[PDB]
Amino acid sequence: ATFEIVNRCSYTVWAAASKGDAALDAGGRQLNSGESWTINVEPGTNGGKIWARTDCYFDDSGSGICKTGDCGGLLRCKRFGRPPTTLAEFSLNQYGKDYIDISNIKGFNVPMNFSPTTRGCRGVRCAADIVGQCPAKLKAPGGGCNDACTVFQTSEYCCTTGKCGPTEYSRFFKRLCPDAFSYVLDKPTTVTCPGSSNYRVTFCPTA
């Protein structure tokens, strides 16, 4: 229920936390380089996500724009953010267990490590330089690395059938981050944790 969101990047990020229809805790906060933000998530939260936003501008009421991960121009996110966005996904207290993962299905903007701060399971990590190695057709002009579905809107990339396979692009994401979801029907890299665990999301976990 406790998530410490740490920004080890050299640049300011704007952390966001939402379960799709509502904000988790405040829903969003500015994180300068090195700052930590502890948030509390309801037990039993299904389908929550934490991500980082890049190059944000907000007014005095918390309205503005982010060049990655914008959630309707809000500082305190109540909706999911705009791709490209590296996703820390979690479902808490699901029949006794927690389930965590990192997803590149909505693209990649900032590296992250998603680890438990309590005993019982391992962490996941996507820290490679996906933005620097991004294929030309996927690069967001000011947003990092898009996913194939965001760029091309085809059944194969978006898995609207529910019977899809890997591509060039998913395979690039999976080559740079094997621990993260590259496409929808990817072999699950989901980690099972003891119910009611606590976690740390670290942006730019490495150098």
Author numbering: 1 to 207
Extract from the study:
The helium path was used for collection of anomalous diffraction data at 5 keV for two proteins: thaumatin and the membrane protein TehA. Although anomalous signals from each individual crystal are very weak, robust anomalous signals are obtained from data assembled from micrometre-sized crystals. The thaumatin structure was determined from 15 microcrystals and the TehA structure from 18 microcrystals. These results demonstrate the usefulness of a helium environment in support of native-SAD phasing at 5 keV.
Thaumatin consists of 207 residues, including 1 me­thio­nine and 16 cysteines forming 8 di­sulfide bridges. The calculated Bijvoet difference ratio is 2.8% at 5 keV. We collected a total of 17 datasets with the helium path, each from a single crystal. Individually, none of them showed significant anomalous signals. We performed native-SAD phasing for the 15-crystal dataset. With an E min cutoff at 1.3 and resolution cutoff at 3.9 Å, we obtained a substructure solution including 9 sulfur peaks from as few as 80 SHELXD trials with the highest CCall and CCweak of 48.6 and 28.7%, respectively [Fig. 3(a)]. BUCCANEER was able to build 206 out of 207 residues automatically. The refined structure has an R/R free of 0.19/0.23, indicating high quality [Fig. 3(c)].
